[PDB]
Amino acid sequence: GLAAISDALAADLAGLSFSSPVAHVYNPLLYAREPHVAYLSRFGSPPKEVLFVGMNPGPWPMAQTGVPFGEVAVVTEWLGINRRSEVSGRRLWGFIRERFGTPERFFARFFVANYCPLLFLTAEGGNITPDKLRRGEQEPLFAACDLALRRTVVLLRPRVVIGVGAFAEARCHEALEGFDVEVGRIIHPSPASPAANRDWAGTALRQLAELGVDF
């Protein structure tokens, strides 16, 4: 199911090439495949009511866990799978754990996925979001990831698809255009935003309430 969709997406992404300012491209679907498959298999069983969609994997330590917004603590201790992104993961998964207690209570209705598996890095070793790639490179990538997302939605059958951040929500709108689904958004957990720092959990919970989602 989800594993097949991910494999096909990996095949489509392998075909793609990227130029400047991208120096290197890391694909966790390839180098972190078994913990990712562990995640998909243990927690991605259909159907879901709500699908959370992140835009990207964090730097290589986050990306290596095979879990979206993955922080090693939550992945190893809560899910039991063998700095901006550290705070983001801690906030998101800490909040999820706070509201649901066990993974089984959360994943019975919810799922968390990344829209784009690729991690793009410059010559300095800094990460570039796909939003910053020029359009000639963005179009094939976005086509591939949109197809993957559509397949994911067809499989999981969610009533609501929620982008984590504005970029993810925009991509969700574009990808799922035509589908009978509600696309909403929650504020991104990153400490880079002052608004998130006021109280991210409260803001997100309220946004979810506005979407009719009982978190």
| Order of strands, sheet of 127-128, starting from the edge strand that comes earlier in the sequence | 24-26, 119-121, 127-128
Reported structure resolution in angstroms = 2.0
First to last CA, the chain: 25
In angstroms, the Cα distances linking 125 to 24, 131, 137, 158, 172 are: 9, 17, 20, 37, 28
137 is in an annotated binding site: no
Report whether 10 contacts 16 (CB < 8 A): no
Establish whether 169 is an annotated binding residue: no
Strand 24-26 with 110-114, pairing:
unpaired
100 marked as part of a ligand binding site: no
User: Quick one: how many helices (H) and strands (E) in the chain?
Assistant: 10, 7
Give the burial string for 55-80 (b: 16+ CB within 10 Å, else e): bbbbbbebbbbbbbbbbeebbeebbe
Q: Which strands make up the sheet holding 110-114, listed edge to edge?
A: 110-114, 50-54, 160-164, 182-186
* Spatial separation of the C-alpha atoms in residues 94 and 118, rounded to whole Å: 25
User: How far apart are alpha carbons 36 and 112 in whole angstroms?
Assistant: 12
Check: CB of residue 75 under 8 Å from CB of residue 36. no
| CATH number reported for the structural domain that contains residue 38 in this entry | 3.40.470.10
User: Distance between CA atoms of 193 and 184, rounded to whole angstroms?
Assistant: 19
For residues 134 and 150, give the distance between their C-alpha atoms in angstroms, rounded to a whole number: 24
Sequence letter at residue 94: G
Parent domain of 127: 1-215
> How many distinct structural domains can be found in the chain?
1
Q: Residues 117, 57: contact at Cβ < 8 Å?
A: yes
Indicate which technique resolved this structure: X-ray
User: Using CB atoms within 10 A of its CB, is residue 170 exposed (0-12), middle (13-18) or buried (19+)?
Assistant: middle
The answer to whether the annotation marks 62 as part of a ligand binding site is: no
Q: Check the annotation: does 69 bind a ligand.
A: yes
